[PDB]
Amino acid sequence: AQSVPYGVSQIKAPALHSQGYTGSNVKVAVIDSGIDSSHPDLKVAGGASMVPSETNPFQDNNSHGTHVAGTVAALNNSIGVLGVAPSASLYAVKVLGADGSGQYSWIINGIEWAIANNMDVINMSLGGPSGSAALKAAVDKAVASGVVVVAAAGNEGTSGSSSTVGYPGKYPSVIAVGAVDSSNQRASFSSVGPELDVMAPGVSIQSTLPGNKYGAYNGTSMASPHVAGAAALILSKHPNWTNTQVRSSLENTTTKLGDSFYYGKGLINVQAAAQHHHHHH
Amino acid sequence: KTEWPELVGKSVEEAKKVILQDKPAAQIIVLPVGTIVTKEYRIDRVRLFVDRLDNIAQVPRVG
Ligand SMILES: [Ca+2]
Ligand code: NA
User: Fold this and answer.
1) Which residue of A160, B26, B36, B61 has the fewest C-beta atoms within 10 A of its own C-beta?
2) Which residue of B has its CA nearest to A94?
């Protein structure tokens, strides 16, 4: 039997599923460590690797990209977990090696591949404390080109009054996502700052792992794909909505939690986001 | 102890030794400073970001 991880329910994805919308025909690039394409609870549609020493994007030597991909799009069947957008066209864009790190140029090359291949949504469960002009230009280009760009806010916790949101999350063109638990409490590691946009479940998140496994991971990496999957659900119900409209629908319909420095606009609610008229619950 | 600001500017070797005294089961991974990394949170992990001289370039922290 299939299990529905609590975070998929918490963002109200089953309400979209019951309406008949599951992300069909929406292309989502998971820009990450690769995706294990042999996992029976995933369907990888395509991809490319920008890691010079790991040329196969369909082998995930880390595990992280496979976990993130299962939150976006684990298949709707009788096994494993259920993804937020289980019919999405899932693309493995490998820009991180086995050790979980990549050079800025590798990430930029993957963003450019995603633009050239007409991806509707990019998920970047990744970050660093410094930006670069070239990184900002690549995310800004993807957004100008119509792509919904979602990233982890970072796991840098608090530092008094200072923002601890990392890049590319910190860029205005990117939706930066923080992590809450099943009680809607901010995870202690979740980055903070005026650039935090929305929150999603990021504690004890069950998803797919390489070699036909499953497991619970923690992080703003786990929160980001709930939002990328929600964007794919919204586009499957409203296929002509722009990235501008998808982003505003998610921001304008969150369940508000605490102060925005810590919680941004609150927890995403994809049911409310995918209605025509938007308000917070 | 979950952060080691006193290790910034020290060798990667001394940082490893110090972190392992405080957290002997730490999984230490050495990475180049100025890379982008996965954003999962691993309570057992300490990433050490080094400059091209192999000195610590950012405050080490658990995660
Ligand atoms: Ca399944
Ligand atoms: Na942002």
Assistant:
1) A160
2) B38
